Amino acid sequence: ATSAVCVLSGDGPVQGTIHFEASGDTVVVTGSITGLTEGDHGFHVHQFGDNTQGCTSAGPHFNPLSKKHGGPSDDERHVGDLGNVTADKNGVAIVDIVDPLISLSGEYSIIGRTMVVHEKPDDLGRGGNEESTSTGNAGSRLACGVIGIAS
Amino acid sequence: ATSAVCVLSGDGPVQGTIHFEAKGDTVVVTGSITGLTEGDHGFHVHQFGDNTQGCTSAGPHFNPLSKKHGGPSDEERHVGDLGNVTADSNGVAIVDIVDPLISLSGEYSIIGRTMVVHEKPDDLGRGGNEESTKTGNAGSRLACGVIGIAS
Ligand SMILES: [Cu+2]
Ligand SMILES: [Cu+2]
Ligand SMILES: [Cu+2]
Ligand SMILES: [Zn+2]
Numbered sequence: 001a002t003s004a005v006c007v008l009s010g011d012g013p014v015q016g017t018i019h020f021e022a023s024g025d026t027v028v029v030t031g032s033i034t035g036l037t038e039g040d041h042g043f044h045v046h047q048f049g050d051n052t053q054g055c056t057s058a059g060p061h062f063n064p065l066s067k068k069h070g071g072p073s074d075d076e077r078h079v080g081d082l083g084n085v086t087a088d089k090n091g092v093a094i095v096d097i098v099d100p101l102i103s104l105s106g107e108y109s110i111i112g113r114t115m116v117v118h119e120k121p122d123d124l125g126r127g128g129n130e131e132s133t134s135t136g137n138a139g140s141r142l143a144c145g146v147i148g149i150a151s
Numbered sequence: 152a153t154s155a156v157c158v159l160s161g162d163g164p165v166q167g168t169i170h171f172e173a174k175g176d177t178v179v180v181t182g183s184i185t186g187l188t189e190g191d192h193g194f195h196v197h198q199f200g201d202n203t204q205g206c207t208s209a210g211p212h213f214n215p216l217s218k219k220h221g222g223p224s225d226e227e228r229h230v231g232d233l234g235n236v237t238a239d240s241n242g243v244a245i246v247d248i249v250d251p252l253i254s255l256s257g258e259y260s261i262i263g264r265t266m267v268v269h270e271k272p273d274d275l276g277r278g279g280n281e282e283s284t285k286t287g288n289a290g291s292r293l294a295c296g297v298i299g300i301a302s
Contacts, residue, residue: 001263007202017203049262049299050156052168059302111200112155112262112300146297148200149263151210 001104005150006115008033010055010143018095018115020147022104029082029097033117033143036087042122042138043095045080045102045147049112055141058114060134064107068133071124072099079108081136084122093117116144152255156301157266159184161206161294169246169266171298173255180233180248184268184294187238193273193289194246196231196253196298200263206292209265211285215258219284222275223250230259232287235273244268267295 004020016033033041046058061069062080070077079101085093102110122136131137155171167184184192197209212220213231221228230252238244253261273287282288 004263005201005203047300048302049297050301051158051296051299052156112152112298114299145202146200146299147263148202148265148297149198150201151199 001111001149003150004104004111004147006145006147008117008143008145012142014143026098026100027102029095031095033093034091036091036093038087038089040084040086040121042118042136043082043085044116045110046114046116049114049146055116055144058116058144062113069125069136110147113147114144115147116141152262152300154301155255155262155298157296157298159268159294159296165294177249177251178253180246182246184244185242187242187244189238189240191235191237191272193269193287194233194236195267196261197265197267200265200297206267206295209267209295213264220276220287261298262300264298265295266298267292
């Protein structure tokens with residue numbers, strides 16, 4: 001696949017559409033998320049594209065290299081660690097990310113996995129407790145969707 | 152992947168959970184769908200895993216080999232053609248299908264694509280009209296979901 005899309009939904013007001021495109025040797029992530037509280041929100045690819053129990057069944061962060069959680073610019077990060085998205089005063093977050101670890105094909109493919117937007121800011125693995133090294137203390141999953149092949 | 156899952160949702164009361172498991176050179180499809188009218192309902196893999204416009208944005212049947220529509224046992228069929236599921240008097244359809252053309256990996260992978268349950272029976276390409284060889288005359292899309300990787 002060269003293009004993918006994800007519609008985020010949850011039990012609250014948070015909604016959004018995220019587009020993925022393979023450009024050259026990298027992946028470009030764009031889109032927008034609405035209904036968020038102003039501020040930073042963790043934004044990650046979780047391992048499973050299973051929404052049988054809402055976003056809970058998406059599992060932990062996608063992590064084929066078995067590393068600890070970090071920010072997108074770190075060497076020590078999960079493949080799914082895309083950092084934070086920032087919502088304005090109106091609750092809108094514009095997504096504009098380029099990432100060197102995710103892919104749309106092969107071992108690092110995120111097709112069929114779940115994009116999640118979280119309640120709190122991701123501390124990028126620097127919070128100092130065990131939880132920071134797993135999830136960045138980003139908290140609950142406000143909305144999520146399975147990443148599918150797009151035209 | 153060797154296992155996948157799909158949660159079917161729509162604008163009406165139809166919902167369901169479908170599981171997929173690679174076994175030998177086949178995929179075993181199991182699960183249940185509820186809220187259906189009694190009788191047969193077309194059941195297909197559509198090409199795109201795009202839910203931006205509900206089930207409509209899923210596109211046509213998955214058809215990488217450019218064939219006409221058929222039933223699952225026909226040589227001339229779409230890869231996505233899984234025939235019909237049957238709902239009982241209480242609106243419950245039990246899914247139990249073994250298919251050799253769909254796959255969870257490689258060229259015919261259905262991960263990231265959409266499963267759709269239709270309003271009418273699939274005529275399996277033997278309807279006598281032109282629509283029969285395209286969609287089986289299965290009509291409306293009652294519910295759909297993107298096929299994701301499962302644990
Ligand atoms: Cu997360
Ligand atoms: Cu169909
Ligand atoms: Cu077909
Ligand atoms: Zn992580």
